[PDB]
């Protein structure tokens, strides 16, 4: 099944480098990154920051490996990482997605 994994990054290059490393490792089939502005508490006051978000699309079987690799690569010590469920998907897209991370590439 298709899963979406979301994370944020301090700049575009960090997002793109990690995203390309995940594709090279066949842990994801695709990523969509977009620029964001963020806010959160840190060191006693609300911080605001410009960031890049990324959506990593992969199959359910890859989720655990994806989490562990994303954690090891991330510039943040405690990064945002969470998964969204998909209810429906275009069948031809799902097949393209499964082939991208299939066992034959390894």
């Amino acid at each position: 099944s298709l899963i979406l994994v979301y994370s944020t990054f301090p700049n575009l290059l960090e997002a793109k480098l990690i995203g390309l490393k995940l594709l090279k490792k066949r842990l994801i089939a695709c990523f969509n990154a977009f620029e964001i502005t963020s806010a959160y508490w840190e060191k006693g006051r609300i911080r605001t920051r410009r960031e890049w978000a990324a959506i990593f699309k992969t199959t359910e079987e890859k989720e655990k490996e994806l989490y562990e690799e994303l954690r090891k690569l991330h510039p943040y010590e405690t990064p945002a990482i969470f998964t969204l469920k998909v209810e429906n998907v275009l069948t031809e897209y799902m097949n393209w997605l499964r082939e991208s991370v299939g066992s034959h590439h390894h």
Binding site: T37, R45, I46, R47, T48, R49, R50
Partner: protein
């Protein structure tokens, strides 16, 4: 290390509210300029309530006017993001309606802006 002149009314900002407003402007400056070294100056200029007029109407002690003095060369998008962040963060830090906050940015060549004696 730019300078923000902050024109407020006497007794509107407590010493802790002053620190929080200054922390808001400075945090926004670091966030959007990318200095890495926090050096910007916030200089509070207090006057008695009633010294501010808007369209001829004398005000209470609410209005805040930030005059930011910056080096030239920064993009229009960076300046608009910085101004927006100053309005929003100061509004929360000072518990004040954003409509009471004015922000003007003036720019100068970096050569004629000296901080910390130039040393």
């Amino acid at each position: 290390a730019m300078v923000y002149m902050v024109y407020v009314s006497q007794d509107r900002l407590t010493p802790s509210a002053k620190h929080a407003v200054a922390q808001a402007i400075t945090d926004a400056h670091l966030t959007h300029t990318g200095e890495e070294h926090s050096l910007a100056q916030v200089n509070f200029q207090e006057q008695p309530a009633g010294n501010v007029f808007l369209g001829g109407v004398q005000q209470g002690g609410d209005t805040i006017f930030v005059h930011g003095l910056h080096r030239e060369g920064r993009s229009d998008e960076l300046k608009q993001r910085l101004i927006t962040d100053i309005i929003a963060k100061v509004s929360i830090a000072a518990d004040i309606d954003p409509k009471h906050i004015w922000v003007y940015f003036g720019e100068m060549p970096a050569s004629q802006m000296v901080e910390y004696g130039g040393l």
